[PDB]
């Protein structure tokens, strides 16, 4: 995706050195900045699209999916580890039930 | 589409419809297109000063639809009020990019040559009417045949026709220009009226028949 | 030239018999005749007024017939607007009061130490700012010694760069004779300064300058080791940037300095003169056939009458079309016909309205109608008549009824009839009659006959000049002149400009170093009366 | 009622010196905007004949474009297409107020209905409307 | 086609027996480099 | 002027100096029929290490130096050579100049 490529060949693609004010280039630069910023958001969404790096709203979505509700004033780093532990819960055996006391201490 | 006309000395509104559409009977619908009050055509301008926009007098333009759009109520409504804005709408409206008219005529068949401009205040320049048609023909001629990112087979091989200036190359260039100009359906025909040579410089001119 | 395509789309459009106009307009250098080929040019060199009202009308007056090359002239003793300030006198290229609105000033930029030149001319919205005037090229120094300086010298008896000098410490290191020789162009100075290891020189970036070094200005004794000093050459930049690039010119009287924005003065159209005579003459040898004066005064019509008489008697045929005033009635026309009774003049009576393509209507004097009509008379191919053609006049001050189209026309005065022939634009001209009082001779009476007469006379004159009066010998009888003339008229019969010629009629006599001929020709004419007789049977 | 009447207003022209001839002013003469930002243009419907010696004359000029867009502020019309040496400058002291825009029959009928309905009195809805007519009255 | 064209009756020759002198004109052939194509109409 | 890059047939994306673009150019110019010009012909160069663009392609060419111009599409390699001007100072005479 390259708004300065991929376009009508005659529209001038870098500013006029001949005089001070160039509305053409100002428009092209604004549009190119907007869509580059869009591209950067769409690349940045790689980390949000994976549980291993999801943060803010997306991690709360993941935790609602898995059923593990976010605790008040809980940071993402401990909340992910909590979710991973709870998905692999170890309970049913007397030793496992005793060992589950760590989460109730 | 429409034909232009002007009010002549003591011509009656009956006379116009009869001459162009054959039957006199059609004048009745024809006055609604020119939005005229009862004194539809009146000789005197100090009588047009009564209520100027709703009348025509000697020397004023008139609008004459084609017979198919004569009966259309939408054509009636549009022609009633738009008046001179007809030609502009019918040739269409577009952004003006002939900012550097002196300049683009120094580097044609090279890219990066055209650019937006500003007219009026705080708004990008726009072009309309016949100027728009010229600008569009100009851009079409100065663009290579497969260089727009969609709908290719647009443009010309003018960038490819540079040759030994013998006459066959000049007829070839003539034919390419004529093809390029006749591509747009709005234009009827083109034809050459002169081709001329100055050593390593071609020169020539083309007449184009634009629909009314 | 760079190799490129280029394409222009032309607003330059919006027959043989050349056509002449003279009248008032706020533009153009006086007395000289101009040649005009489409009004998109004329509109640049005149401004407005009657002459340009006439021209834009002269080419539009009929959809299928129009005048070819037009010749025009301004009837004014105009002077340009001018001012004086600094060492500079300012002169405007346009002649008329319109020039007085043009403004010029010189401002200055302390940062670059260059002069800002600005032209204002609101009436065209023409507004241009030339900057970087001054600073032609820089000198710079690179040696280790104590001090480096330079100087330009002006010899008083030439007011031109006599010398250019470079110094190190207190001794000259090079010299240049900039009046005349190798260094006449600043390109050589730039190269030959750079060649010295201790020195440097660099040229300004604002495109080309490279002045002739004779027009530098006198700068002396500036420290090069301290500054990359400019040489200025201010008047060189004025020429380079305002020779072909402006509405207003400069001339050098002597130091130049900035000044405020100022309005130019002295521009004057000039009152009308007493007479047109020794300015009307100037069209003679440009070859025009039809002429019209754009005024109503009867004095002017008497000078045009005398003029056309003066040229036609010389073998230089011409014909004039004239039109007086507005609304003028029958008795005034008869008084003006009698007073101006000669042939080769055709008085046109009516007055009315016209509409230029910009939308502008007009209330039209009769000399404008004569020009509009002249546009048809010139544009028709030789010999064919204006009679019954449509004239495209938008409306007319119609008083001139059917009976008047007997009285006006039989006295030899052209008119337009209001005509309800709906198949085309209504108005049409009745006749092509001249101002001459006598009906009998058609060569005098009918413009479409006099035209073919003049062209046949002139061509037969040239042929006899070619074949015989170049005087190879007397030993070529009358009988061979009879044969040549019959040969010649055989081409006129073959090529369809004469109806017939009874070749037997040609009678030839020779009287030594002179000869004489008599002949008959049946002229081509338009039809003018069509009579049908319609008869019954059984 | 409004019928899309194009904007018009009085305009005055001035000359360097008093005239010495009956100058002609054709119908269809264009008075172009002096300001670059204003694309508005105006035309003269009827011919005017300057007096022999009057130093100033006022004429009426109609705009080419209908609607509210034809309105122009004061001190904008200062150029004439058919210029002359004698002509100095043009100005319009009074602003163009006669700009008019035409609505549909429904818009014409709705105000009439509102006026008729507003004349009702001695009812709950009419009391409520009459209270809401005064400002600082809501809910 | 090795030259564009030439005028035949614009050749001058001079001779003195020890040396001949020649003059001739040729109209050359070379690539186009400026193409100025204009557009008009009849509106 | 320019120094380009070429896809050398080993698969070798060679960045190549200016005196070698002169080979690529001289080779093409030598092969064509007599009297044709390199003017507006395309070259199969891959990419350019370049400063010069449209306004510079007035400056350099006007002073008698050749350079290659970037045309964004359809013309075979996107690259065509602007002129055939020589290093001689005076451009008025075409035999010397071009």
Q: How far is CA C437 from CA C170, C345, D134, in A?
A: 96, 11, 90
**Cα torsion at B22, B23, B24, B25 (round to 10°)?**
-150
Nearest CA to C307 out of C297, C316, C295 is that of C316
Q: Which chains pack against E, by 3+ Cβ pairs within 8 A?
A: B, C, F
Burial of B185 (0-12, 13-18, 19+ CB in 10 A): exposed
Nearest CA to D24 out of C363, C96, C355, C58 is that of C363
Across the interface, which of E37, E40, E42 has its CB nearest the CB of B177? E37
Given an 8 Å threshold on Cβ–Cβ distance, is C3 in contact with F57? no
Kindly give, in sequence order, each residue whose CB lies less than 8 Å from that of residue F61, ignoring residues fewer than 6 positions away.
Answer: C2, F67, F82, F83, F85
Distance, in Å, from the CA atom of C203 to the CA atom of C233, rounded to the nearest integer, reads 13
Q: Nearest-CA residue of chain C relative to B18?
A: C422
Q: How far is CA C316 from CA C99, C287, C324, C384, in A?
A: 39, 8, 26, 21
Q: Is some CB atom of chain A closer than 8 A to the CB atom of B116?
A: yes
Burial of C432 (0-12, 13-18, 19+ CB in 10 A): buried
Contacts of B9 in chain C (CB under 8 A): 394-396, 418, 426-427
Across the interface, which of E36, E39, E40 has its CB nearest the CB of C6? E36
Across the interface, which of F36, F39, F72 has its CB nearest the CB of B111? F72
Question: Which H/E stretch holds residue C23?
Answer: strand C19-23
Distance, in Å, from the CA atom of E24 to the CA atom of E8, rounded to the nearest integer, reads 9
Q: Is D4 left (phi over 0), alpha (psi -120 to 50) or beta?
A: left
Q: Which chains pack against D, by 3+ Cβ pairs within 8 A?
A: B, C
Q: How far is CA C419 from CA B20, C184, C425, F94, in A?
A: 20, 75, 9, 66
* Residue B109 to chain D, least CA–CA distance (Å): 33
Q: How far is CA B181 from CA B170, C7, C14, C128, in A?
A: 16, 13, 21, 36
Question: Which H/E stretch holds residue C486?
Answer: helix C478-494
* Residue F8 to chain C, least CA–CA distance (Å): 31
Q: Nearest-CA residue of chain B relative to F81?
A: B110
Tally of CA atoms within 13 A in the half-sphere of C194 that contains its CB: 11
**Cα torsion at C247, C250, C256, C258 (round to 10°)?**
-20
Distance, in Å, from the CA atom of C176 to the CA atom of C231, rounded to the nearest integer, reads 15
Tokens of C430: 């009745």
* Residue C3 to chain E, least CA–CA distance (Å): 5
Q: Nearest-CA residue of chain D relative to C53?
A: D82
Contacts of B205 in chain C (CB under 8 A): 10
Pairing mode of beta strands C515-518, C103-109: unpaired
Kindly give, in sequence order, each residue whose CB lies less than 8 Å from that of residue C58, ignoring residues fewer than 6 positions away.
Answer: C19, C21, C66, C67, C70, C371, C372, C374, C375
CB C247 within 8 A of CB C240: no
Q: Which value in Å is the resolution of this experimental model? A: 4.5
Tokens of C94: 């346009």
Q: Is some CB atom of chain C closer than 8 A to the CB atom of D29?
A: yes
Tokens of C39: 């009004």
Q: Nearest-CA residue of chain F relative to B110?
A: F71
Judged by 3 or more CB pairs under 8 A, whether E touches C is yes
Q: How many Cβ pairs closer than 8 A exist between chain C and E? A: 30
* Residue D52 to chain C, least CA–CA distance (Å): 17
Hey, which residues 108-167 in chain C have their CB within 8 Å of chain D? 122-123, 125
Across the interface, which of D36, D45, D66 has its CB nearest the CB of B49? D45
Method of elucidation: cryo-EM
Distance, in Å, from the CA atom of C119 to the CA atom of C103, rounded to the nearest integer, reads 6
Tally of CA atoms within 13 A in the half-sphere of E2 that contains its CB: 1
Q: Is C40 left (phi over 0), alpha (psi -120 to 50) or beta?
A: alpha
Question: Which H/E stretch holds residue C200?
Answer: strand C199-203
Residues in chain A: 105
Distance, in Å, from the CA atom of D18 to the CA atom of C423, rounded to the nearest integer, reads 49
Contacts of F74 in chain B (CB under 8 A): 144-147
Q: How many CB atoms lie within 10 A of CB C79?
A: 15
Judged by 3 or more CB pairs under 8 A, whether D touches F is no
Three-class DSSP category at C459: helix
Distance, in Å, from the CA atom of A59 to the CA atom of A81, rounded to the nearest integer, reads 12
Distance, in Å, from the CA atom of C178 to the CA atom of C151, rounded to the nearest integer, reads 12
- Give the bridge partners for C414, in sequence order: C348
Given an 8 Å threshold on Cβ–Cβ distance, is B143 in contact with A13? no
Contacts of B55 in chain D (CB under 8 A): none
Kindly give, in sequence order, each residue whose CB lies less than 8 Å from that of residue C536, ignoring residues fewer than 6 positions away.
Answer: none
Question: Which H/E stretch holds residue C82?
Answer: strand C82-85
Distance, in Å, from the CA atom of C517 to the CA atom of C506, rounded to the nearest integer, reads 7
Distance, in Å, from the CA atom of F28 to the CA atom of F80, rounded to the nearest integer, reads 12
Question: Which H/E stretch holds residue C371?
Answer: helix C366-379
Q: Is some CB atom of chain A closer than 8 A to the CB atom of B95?
A: no
Burial of B161 (0-12, 13-18, 19+ CB in 10 A): buried
Identify the DSSP state of C129. E
Burial of E1 (0-12, 13-18, 19+ CB in 10 A): exposed
Q: Is some CB atom of chain B closer than 8 A to the CB atom of C141?
A: no
CB C35 within 8 A of CB C287: no
Distance, in Å, from the CA atom of C3 to the CA atom of F80, rounded to the nearest integer, reads 12
Distance, in Å, from the CA atom of C288 to the CA atom of C300, rounded to the nearest integer, reads 19
Contacts of B189 in chain E (CB under 8 A): none
Given an 8 Å threshold on Cβ–Cβ distance, is A17 in contact with F72? no
Distance, in Å, from the CA atom of B35 to the CA atom of D66, rounded to the nearest integer, reads 14
Distance, in Å, from the CA atom of B157 to the CA atom of B146, rounded to the nearest integer, reads 9
Contacts of B105 in chain C (CB under 8 A): 6-8
Distance, in Å, from the CA atom of D23 to the CA atom of D35, rounded to the nearest integer, reads 27
Contacts of F85 in chain B (CB under 8 A): none
Distance, in Å, from the CA atom of C101 to the CA atom of C98, rounded to the nearest integer, reads 6
Identify the DSSP state of C33. P
Contacts of C203 in chain F (CB under 8 A): none
Radius of gyration (C-alpha) of chain B in whole angstroms = 23
Nearest CA to F64 out of F98, F28, F22, F19 is that of F98
Q: How many CB atoms lie within 10 A of CB D94?
A: 10
Q: How far is CA C332 from CA B105, C115, C413, C416, in A?
A: 59, 65, 12, 18
Given an 8 Å threshold on Cβ–Cβ distance, is C96 in contact with D27? no
Nearest CA to C92 out of C344, C262, C286 is that of C262
Secondary structure (DSSP) of C264-277: -B--B--PPPS--H
> C235-251 burial string, b = 16+ CB within 10 Å, else e?
bbbbbbbbeeebbbbbe
- Give the bridge partners for D59, in sequence order: D11
CB C237 within 8 A of CB C210: no
CB C372 within 8 A of CB C391: yes
Secondary structure (DSSP) of C318-349: -EEEE---SS--HHHHHHHHHTT--SSEEEB-
Distance, in Å, from the CA atom of D21 to the CA atom of D14, rounded to the nearest integer, reads 15
Q: Is some CB atom of chain C closer than 8 A to the CB atom of E30?
A: no
Q: How many Cβ pairs closer than 8 A exist between chain B and D? A: 27
Residue with tokens 């990112």: B149
Pairing mode of beta strands C290-293, C19-23: parallel
Distance, in Å, from the CA atom of C54 to the CA atom of C70, rounded to the nearest integer, reads 11
Radius of gyration (C-alpha) of chain D in whole angstroms = 23
Distance, in Å, from the CA atom of C71 to the CA atom of C54, rounded to the nearest integer, reads 12
Beta strands in C88-183, from DSSP E residues, in sequence order: 88-92, 103-109, 114-121, 126-133, 137-141, 148-155, 160-168, 171-176
Distance, in Å, from the CA atom of A13 to the CA atom of A8, rounded to the nearest integer, reads 10
Q: Is some CB atom of chain D closer than 8 A to the CB atom of C269?
A: yes
Three-class DSSP category at C456: helix
Across the interface, which of F36, F70, F73 has its CB nearest the CB of B147? F73
Tokens of D50: 């300057």
Q: Provide the edge-to-edge strand list for the sheet that holds C4-9.
A: B187-198, B201-210, E34-41, C4-9
Secondary structure (DSSP) of chain A: --TTSSS-TTB--S--SSSS--HHHHHHHHHHHHHHHHHHHHHHHHHHTSTTT--THHHHHHHHHHT-PPPTT--HHHHHHHHHHHHT---SSHHHHHHGGGGG-
Q: Nearest-CA residue of chain C relative to D80?
A: C123
Pairing mode of beta strands C103-109, C160-168: unpaired
Q: Nearest-CA residue of chain D relative to B48?
A: D45
- The end-to-end CA distance of chain C, in Å, is 87
- Give the bridge partners for D57, in sequence order: D13
Q: Is some CB atom of chain E closer than 8 A to the CB atom of C9?
A: yes
Distance, in Å, from the CA atom of E34 to the CA atom of C1, rounded to the nearest integer, reads 8
Distance of CA C276 to the CA centre of its chain: 18
Secondary structure (DSSP) of chain B: -EEEEEPPTT--HHHHHHHHHS-GGGHHHHHHHTT--SS-EES-HHHHTTSGGG-EETT-EEEEE-HHHHS-HHHHHHHHHHTTHHHHHHH-EEE--BS-HHHHTTSBTSSS-BB--B-SSSSB-EEETHHHHHHHHHHHHTSBTT-SSSS-S-SBSTTT------HHHHHHHHHHHHHHHHTSTTEEEEEEEEEEEETTEEEEEEEEEE--
């Amino acid at each position: 995706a390259n708004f300065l490529k991929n376009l009508h060949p005659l529209l001038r693609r870098d500013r006029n050195k001949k005089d001070n004010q160039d509305p053409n280039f100002a428009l092209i630069d604004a549009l190119n900045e907007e869509m580059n910023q869009v591209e950067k958001d769409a690349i940045e969404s790689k980390l949000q699209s994976s549980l291993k790096t999801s943060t803010s709203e997306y991690l709360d979505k993941f935790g609602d999916w898995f059923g593990v509700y976010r605790k008040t004033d809980e940071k993402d780093d401990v909340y992910r580890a909590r979710i991973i532990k709870y998905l692999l819960l170890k309970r049913g055996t007397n030793n496992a039930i005793i060992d589950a006391i760590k989460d109730y201490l | 589409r429409f034909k232009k006309h002007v009010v002549q000395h003591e011509e009656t509104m009956q006379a116009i419809a009869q001459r162009y559409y054959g039957d006199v009977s059609y004048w009745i619908d024809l006055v609604e297109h020119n939005n005229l009050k009862y004194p539809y055509l009146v000789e005197t301008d100090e009588e047009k000063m009564k209520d100027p926009e709703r009348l025509a007098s000697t020397g004023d333009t008139l609008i004459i639809p084609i017979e198919s759009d004569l009966t259309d109520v939408s054509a009636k409504e549009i022609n009633s009020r738009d008046k001179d804005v007809l030609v502009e709408l019918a040739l269409g409206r577009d952004l003006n990019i002939t900012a550097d008219e002196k300049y683009f005529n120094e580097h044609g068949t090279s890219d990066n040559i055209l650019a937006f401009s500003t007219n009026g205040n705080g708004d990008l320049d726009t072009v309309k009417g016949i100027d728009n048609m010229k600008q569009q023909l100009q851009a079409r001629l100065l663009t290579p045949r497969g260089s727009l990112m969609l709908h290719p087979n647009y443009g010309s091989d003018l960038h490819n026709l540079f040759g030994l200036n013998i006459p066959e190359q000049a007829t070839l260039i003539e034919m390419e220009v004529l093809r390029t100009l006749t591509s747009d359906n709005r234009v009827k025909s083109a034809n050459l009226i002169d081709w001329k040579i100055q050593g390593n410089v071609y020169s020539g001119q083309f007449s184009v028949e634009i629909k009314s | 030239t760079r190799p490129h395509a280029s394409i222009e789309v032309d607003t330059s459009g919006i027959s043989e018999k050349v056509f002449c106009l003279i009248g008032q307009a706020e533009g153009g250098e006086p007395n000289t005749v101009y040649e005009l080929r489409n009004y998109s040019q004329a509109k640049r060199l005149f401004r407005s007024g009657e002459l340009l009202d006439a021209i834009e009308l002269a080419w539009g007056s009929n959809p299928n017939y129009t005048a070819g090359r037009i010749l025009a002239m301004r009837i004014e003793d105009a002077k340009p607007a001018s001012a004086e300030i600094g060492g500079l006198k300012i002169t405007s290229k346009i002649y008329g009061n319109v020039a007085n609105n043009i403004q010029v000033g010189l401002e200055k930029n302390t940062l670059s130490d260059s002069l800002r030149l600005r032209v204002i001319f609101q009436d065209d919205r023409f507004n241009e700012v030339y900057d970087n005037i001054g600073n032609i090229f820089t000198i710079k120094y690179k040696g280790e010694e104590a001090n480096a300086t330079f100087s330009v010298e002006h010899d008083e008896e030439t007011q031109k760069a006599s010398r250019l000098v470079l110094k190190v410490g207190d001794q000259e290191v090079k010299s240049y004779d900039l009046t005349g020789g190798a260094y006449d162009y600043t390109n050589a100075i730039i190269t030959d300064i750079n060649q010295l290891p201790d020195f440097e020189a660099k040229l300004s970036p604002f495109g080309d300058k490279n002045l002739e070094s004779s027009k530098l200005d006198k700068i002396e004794n500036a420290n090069i080791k301290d500054k990359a000093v400019y040489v200025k050459a201010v008047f060189g930049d004025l020429e380079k940037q305002t020779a072909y690039n402006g509405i207003v010119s400069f001339e050098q009287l002597k130091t130049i300095e900035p000044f405020e924005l100022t309005k130019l003065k002295g521009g004057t159209n000039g009152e009308p003169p007493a007479t047109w005579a020794d300015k009307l003459d100037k069209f003679a040898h440009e070859g025009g056939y039809y002429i019209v004066p754009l005024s109503s005064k009867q004095s002017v019509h008497a000078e045009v009458a005398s003029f056309v008489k003066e040229r036609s008697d010389a073998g230089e045929p011409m014909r004039a079309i004239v039109g007086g005033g507005f609304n003028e009635s029958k008795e005034q026309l008869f008084g003006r016909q009698a007073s101006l009774s000669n042939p080769r003049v055709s008085l046109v009576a009516n007055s009315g309205t016209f509409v230029m393509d910009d939308g502008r209507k007009n209330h039209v004097p009769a000399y404008m109608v004569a020009v509009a009509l002249g546009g048809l008379a010139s544009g028709l191919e030789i010999g064919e008549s204006i009679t019954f053609k449509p004239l495209r006049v938008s409306s007319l001050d119609q008083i001139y009824e059917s009976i008047d189209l007997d009285e006006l026309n039989e006295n030899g005065i052209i008119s337009i009839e209001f005509v309800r022939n709906r198949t085309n634009t209504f108005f049409r001209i009745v006749d092509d009659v001249t101002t001459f009082n006598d009906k009998s001779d058609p060569v005098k009476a009918e413009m479409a006959v006099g035209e073919a007469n003049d062209f046949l006379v002139s061509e037969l004159k040239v042929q006899l000049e070619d074949q015989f009066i170049g005087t190879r010998t007397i030993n070529t009888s009358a009988s061979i002149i009879k044969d040549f003339i019959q040969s010649y008229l055989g081409r006129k019969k073959r090529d369809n400009e004469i109806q017939d010629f009874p070749a037997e009629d040609v009678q030839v006599i020779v009287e030594g170093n002179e000869a004489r001929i008599s002949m008959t020709v049946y002229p081509i004419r338009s039809f003018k009366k069509i009579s049908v007789s319609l008869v019954y049977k059984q | 009622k409004r019928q899309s009447k194009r904007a018009y207003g009085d305009v005055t022209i001035q000359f360097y010196q008093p005239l010495d001839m009956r100058m002609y002013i054709p119908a269809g003469t264009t008075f172009t905007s002096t300001r670059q930002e204003y694309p508005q243009q105006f035309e003269t419907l009827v011919d005017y004949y300057a007096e022999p010696d009057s130093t100033e004359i006022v004429v009426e000029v109609y705009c080419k474009e209908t609607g509210v867009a034809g309105n122009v502020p004061e001190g904008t019309i200062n150029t004439i297409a058919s210029g002359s040496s004698l002509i100095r400058s043009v100005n319009n002291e009074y602003s163009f107020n006669t700009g008019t825009k035409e609505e549909s029959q429904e818009d014409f009928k709705r105000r009439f209905h509102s006026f008729v309905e507003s004349r009702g009195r001695a009812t709950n809805k009419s009391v409520r409307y009459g209270a809401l007519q005064i400002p600082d009255v809501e809910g």
